[PDB]
Design an enzyme around this catalytic site. Structure first.
Site, mmCIF file in Angstrom:
data_model
loop_
_atom_site.group_PDB
_atom_site.id
_atom_site.type_symbol
_atom_site.label_atom_id
_atom_site.label_comp_id
_atom_site.label_asym_id
_atom_site.label_seq_id
_atom_site.Cartn_x
_atom_site.Cartn_y
_atom_site.Cartn_z
ATOM 1 N N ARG A 1 -71.137 -43.396 20.621
ATOM 2 C CA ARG A 1 -70.999 -43.074 19.202
ATOM 3 C C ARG A 1 -72.216 -42.304 18.669
ATOM 4 N NH1 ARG A 1 -66.383 -46.130 18.731
ATOM 5 N NH2 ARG A 1 -66.916 -47.623 20.383
ATOM 6 N N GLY A 17 -65.551 -45.904 33.760
ATOM 7 C CA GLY A 17 -64.798 -46.084 32.530
ATOM 8 C C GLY A 17 -63.294 -45.928 32.684
ATOM 9 N N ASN A 67 -68.836 -39.351 29.285
ATOM 10 C CA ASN A 67 -67.971 -40.099 30.184
ATOM 11 C C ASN A 67 -66.859 -39.251 30.754
ATOM 12 O OD1 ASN A 67 -69.201 -42.563 30.210
ATOM 13 N ND2 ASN A 67 -67.893 -43.442 28.599
ATOM 14 N N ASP A 90 -72.123 -50.277 25.147
ATOM 15 C CA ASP A 90 -72.070 -48.893 25.616
ATOM 16 C C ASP A 90 -71.488 -47.967 24.553
ATOM 17 O OD1 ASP A 90 -73.033 -49.325 28.186
ATOM 18 O OD2 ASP A 90 -71.116 -49.726 29.098
ATOM 19 N N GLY A 91 -70.607 -48.503 23.705
ATOM 20 C CA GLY A 91 -69.959 -47.733 22.651
ATOM 21 C C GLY A 91 -70.909 -47.281 21.556
HETATM 22 N N1 LIG Z 1 -59.413 -48.153 30.959
HETATM 23 C C1 LIG Z 1 -58.770 -47.759 29.872
HETATM 24 O O1 LIG Z 1 -57.383 -48.037 29.791
HETATM 25 C C2 LIG Z 1 -59.504 -47.055 28.754
HETATM 26 C C3 LIG Z 1 -58.799 -46.646 27.614
HETATM 27 C C4 LIG Z 1 -59.484 -45.997 26.588
HETATM 28 C C5 LIG Z 1 -60.860 -45.751 26.702
HETATM 29 N N2 LIG Z 1 -61.551 -46.154 27.817
HETATM 30 C C6 LIG Z 1 -62.997 -45.866 27.972
HETATM 31 O O2 LIG Z 1 -63.792 -46.278 26.874
HETATM 32 C C7 LIG Z 1 -64.677 -45.240 26.462
HETATM 33 C C8 LIG Z 1 -64.784 -45.245 24.945
HETATM 34 O O3 LIG Z 1 -63.452 -45.258 24.422
HETATM 35 P P1 LIG Z 1 -62.899 -46.315 23.308
HETATM 36 O O4 LIG Z 1 -64.067 -46.462 22.376
HETATM 37 O O5 LIG Z 1 -61.511 -45.912 22.870
HETATM 38 O O6 LIG Z 1 -62.752 -47.717 24.106
HETATM 39 P P2 LIG Z 1 -63.918 -48.828 23.911
HETATM 40 O O7 LIG Z 1 -65.348 -48.150 23.887
HETATM 41 O O8 LIG Z 1 -63.567 -49.577 22.666
HETATM 42 O O9 LIG Z 1 -63.703 -49.826 25.191
HETATM 43 C C9 LIG Z 1 -64.100 -49.403 26.487
HETATM 44 C C10 LIG Z 1 -64.820 -50.503 27.259
HETATM 45 O O10 LIG Z 1 -65.467 -49.860 28.351
HETATM 46 C C11 LIG Z 1 -66.887 -49.898 28.194
HETATM 47 N N3 LIG Z 1 -67.442 -48.601 28.656
HETATM 48 C C12 LIG Z 1 -67.641 -47.432 27.950
HETATM 49 N N4 LIG Z 1 -68.158 -46.500 28.797
HETATM 50 C C13 LIG Z 1 -68.282 -47.052 30.028
HETATM 51 C C14 LIG Z 1 -68.745 -46.550 31.248
HETATM 52 N N5 LIG Z 1 -69.189 -45.291 31.329
HETATM 53 N N6 LIG Z 1 -68.733 -47.386 32.365
HETATM 54 C C15 LIG Z 1 -68.284 -48.702 32.274
HETATM 55 N N7 LIG Z 1 -67.825 -49.185 31.058
HETATM 56 C C16 LIG Z 1 -67.828 -48.373 29.957
HETATM 57 C C17 LIG Z 1 -67.129 -50.294 26.733
HETATM 58 O O11 LIG Z 1 -68.382 -50.910 26.495
HETATM 59 C C18 LIG Z 1 -65.931 -51.219 26.490
HETATM 60 O O12 LIG Z 1 -66.105 -52.526 27.016
HETATM 61 C C19 LIG Z 1 -64.085 -43.928 26.968
HETATM 62 O O13 LIG Z 1 -65.080 -42.983 27.324
HETATM 63 C C20 LIG Z 1 -63.210 -44.356 28.137
HETATM 64 O O14 LIG Z 1 -63.862 -44.074 29.358
HETATM 65 C C21 LIG Z 1 -60.888 -46.795 28.842
#
Ligand SMILES: NC(=O)c1ccc[n+]([C@@H]2O[C@H](COP(=O)([O-])OP(=O)(O)OC[C@H]3O[C@@H](n4cnc5c(N)ncnc54)[C@H](O)[C@@H]3O)[C@@H](O)[C@H]2O)c1
Ligand SMILES: NC(=O)c1ccc[n+]([C@@H]2O[C@H](COP(=O)([O-])OP(=O)(O)OC[C@H]3O[C@@H](n4cnc5c(N)ncnc54)[C@H](O)[C@@H]3O)[C@@H](O)[C@H]2O)c1
Ligand SMILES: NC(=O)c1ccc[n+]([C@@H]2O[C@H](COP(=O)([O-])OP(=O)(O)OC[C@H]3O[C@@H](n4cnc5c(N)ncnc54)[C@H](O)[C@@H]3O)[C@@H](O)[C@H]2O)c1
Ligand SMILES: NC(=O)c1ccc[n+]([C@@H]2O[C@H](COP(=O)([O-])OP(=O)(O)OC[C@H]3O[C@@H](n4cnc5c(N)ncnc54)[C@H](O)[C@@H]3O)[C@@H](O)[C@H]2O)c1
Lengths: 249, 249, 249, 249
Positions: C54, C157, C115, C49-50
């Protein structure tokens, strides 16, 4: 040395009969639990957690319970059919035991609970008005479908389903939690099982371990009793807690 | 019998001097917390919960603490400015004290939290891959903004905000709850405080009582310590627990 | 007709390069995303998803994205590698799309989040005082580790881990939920995406999709931008939602 | 032009008769709700949200309702005893009108719910086993005390208590949350109201806005109805949503 085997159905009872015979143990069979179970040195329950709770309802003085589990999951139990022949040999030979407290309701005078004393609405989908106080002090007042007064053993049952914390079986406490509370904020209250809980509600019901329930208006008192539930030192009880819990329903 | 009177702003300190003088107690004012505080018969803290946590870091051996709350809500304090003079008197005349344990992290050896140790991400808006293990055994492996290892006292602090239960002050135990866990199901665990906690994560910091913080990579243990926090007996500690919790903001 | 295949690792890229070959489509390899992706009839991302989030940071006007989930789990992706051969052919011949809104910030002007936008503390372990209004009415003023303005897409997310509801992708809305709120009762609000959000906070940052961050103080506004994320049509997006959400870890 | 005043007790009903008397509106009084209320230009409920639900149960085609909350907090009502005179006059001459939808269920076919259709356990302190589907899709299968299919208007009702999100009254959508689910990991789902909800229980009962209820054994179907609820326009509906939710008790 005498032993009782309680069972839901014929499942595996033949091999347990021959498992205890190999170990020099007198055996008697029990389709339903009776108060006669406390004439035996130990008890081998066969069915699951539910089966164990129905046994305890016919026991004040509790002879040690070994617990074969038929189903998929069980927290109070000791073994499965796959491997009970081994774990029973250990259980009886050491004869080490543990004891978890059983609480008692004031309105249901002699029936004890291992899991909890829930206080529910008499009519379904109707909301009762619950006032809680422990050791005199007004702890809360809240409208809800019900209120739970669980031990740590029962922190993995109804309490778990209302949003409660998973409390390891050895730390000895009440967990006080509402069911569908109609209020902005609310929090579970964990307290020492040395306190005296009191619930006050009109048009209600009281249920010990989902088994004996009576109607009551007014108020009830719930405290720790003199007669715990005796099992068989399950050395792995603690390490197995986080995993049985991961896979509920 | 001399005394230390610690303060942030110049609160009701003219008055607290004058009440201490009238109870024939020598007074040394402290502009900020100091290690030097060990050498007093007791400490009057004058500010809030935060004032007391800070005081405690600079202590190993802990003289009795009479905390006064000039703010809205303090769970650690005995009185407010309206009633402080009557309670301080009762408190010092009877001199009954009580003690809640302090905990200890590997990363910072000679530092002690009364509330909690929190392991969070070095950089914010970022998750760490935390793995927890109580007493040799694996209990969890979650992704999160952080994980919290907290005493019952600190059940009402940070852990309270992460969804944790409110445990009364007189039930010694640990409360292990994640901040913002990325996972379908999770649960706060409440286990005994006589246990060895271990946290495993990379690219993270540890934070003792929101005061001392230190970057860490790999492994830490959190365990009970031998030098606890000491306050004067509060007759109403339990009673007020439930009122104060509902006014948290 | 022409397409850009964006990847992180160069694993499955020669298989996909040859799938697009026998579809009368010209190919261009992209080791990292770029503003140059706007000049292609569609995009094939190759990763989680990243890899997608990106990509969208370099797009304003957005050509359709076909996502191939490499390891991982993801609810923005269209296919795994061991079935993609088929699914690509179906998706590009039909050439049928659907669009999801992205929001914008005040503090980061040219940037777009699919998101969420997350407002957090600048120093970790410190909580900030957030003060949120939507369409001009004050809704809330809470002390927290952070605050998340999410869309239905990113409700699985960050807002999922803060305790949010699962909202389906086809229901356009904001989700407003704090992270570690130090307050007795709190609740997420779901509101219309046509409303103007406004967060107020000192000593903070803002983060669109965990990708871009800028320090800020005072106020920011979040609004619905006119430049949506564009994906090929996943008919099974709704029926997959519930089974993917269960497997989140 | 004539109107119907509907009350429960004789609270401020004389003063309300006199307000409608000064507006040249012929008034008939109602001890309780009848089908008869269909033959009026508008209606003035006097009591609370619950009084309004009762009125609505007797109505297919709904004439404007003006609720006066004599209680404490009313999501559905316009005014209090203090300022009912002002607001009643304002809105009667403006005659603007809002339409929030009501929902039919496939077991008590001609009844209508503004808030929800709750599927509960038939006996109390026993959990049922609800299977949820929507537009033919297996979205869940869960053991629980019951299951709420709520609308946004009833998201500050029973669903609120069950752990549900607050939803703005103008974002049309279902809400699918259980009561006391026995499972490590659940989440409320928010889906479009154009979708077809379907619940499959055993040993159950269906309830609609807490009023009319009938035993059911098999499978039911909840879906957006033809005739909605109709109130005069509340210019401050959105604004007051948040301070009212904060004092739900
Ligand atoms: N839950 C948390 O403590 C936390 C913390 C930081 C970021 N995030 C989420 O990750 C996204 C990208 O931030 P990052 O790159 O710093 O972390 P990341 O992308 O490295 O990790 C986030 C995880 O969540 C997944 N993900 C991303 N969007 C999603 C969605 N819409 N629904 C379900 N899963 C999803 C990714 O594939 C990955 O496994 C942000 O938009 C945020 O929503 C979550
Ligand atoms: N979650 C709920 O909606 C709900 C409703 C009623 C009863 N209960 C609980 O079930 C227990 C037995 O009541 P019943 O016979 O009416 O229902 P039951 O025995 O038919 O079903 C309850 C389930 O809980 C499990 N269980 C029992 N004790 C447990 C424990 N200590 N930890 C984890 N799981 C446990 C059983 O294996 C069973 O699957 C009671 O002690 C009560 O706590 C839960
Ligand atoms: N809720 C959160 O998002 C959050 C974040 C960081 C720290 N904290 C708590 O604050 C403590 C001190 O950290 P800091 O110096 O960074 O912030 P601090 O001392 O300024 O603020 C903590 C807030 O919570 C109150 N508080 C302190 N101890 C408490 C307790 N035991 N029970 C209930 N409330 C309490 C304080 O009066 C203050 O309002 C930490 O030990 C931690 O428990 C909470
Ligand atoms: N929270 C619970 O445990 C629970 C239980 C049963 C019913 N209810 C709710 O109450 C409604 C009517 O049930 P009843 O007549 O049996 O009890 P009721 O109407 O007397 O009690 C429900 C309480 O919620 C209020 N209420 C009704 N609709 C509301 C709304 N949309 N937002 C906020 N509060 C609202 C009522 O005024 C009352 O204070 C149902 O539609 C259901 O939403 C809640």
């Amino acid at each position: 040395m005498r032993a009782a085997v309680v069972y839901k159905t014929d499942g595996h009872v033949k091999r347990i009969e021959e498992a205890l015979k190999r170990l020099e143990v007198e055996v008697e069979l029990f389709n339903q639990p009776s108060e006669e179970l406390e004439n035996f040195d130990f008890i081998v329950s066969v069915g699951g957690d539910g089966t164990i709770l129905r046994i305890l309802q016919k026991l004040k003085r509790c002879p040690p319970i070994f617990g074969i589990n038929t189903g998929r999951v069980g927290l109070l139990t000791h073994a499965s059919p796959e491997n009970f022949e081994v774990e029973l040999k250990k259980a009886v030979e050491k004869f080490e035991v543990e004891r978890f407290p059983r609480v008692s309701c004031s309105a249901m005078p002699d029936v004890l609970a291992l899991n909890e004393i829930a206080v529910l609405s008499r009519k379904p989908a109707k909301m009762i008005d619950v006032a809680l106080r422990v050791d005199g002090v007004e702890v809360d007042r809240i409208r809800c479908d019900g209120f739970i007064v669980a031990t740590q053993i029962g922190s993995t049952g109804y309490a778990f389903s209302a949003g409660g914390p998973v409390v390891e079986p050895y730390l000895e406490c009440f967990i006080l939690i509402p069911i569908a509370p109609f209020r902005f904020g609310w929090k579970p209250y964990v307290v020492s099982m040395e306190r005296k809980i009191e619930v006050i509600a009109e048009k209600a019901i009281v249920v010990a371990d989902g088994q004996k329930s009576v109607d009551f208006d007014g108020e009830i008192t719930i405290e720790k009793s003199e007669f715990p539930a005796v099992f068989f030192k399950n050395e792995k009880r603690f390490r197995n807690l986080f995993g049985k819990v991961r896979s509920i329903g």
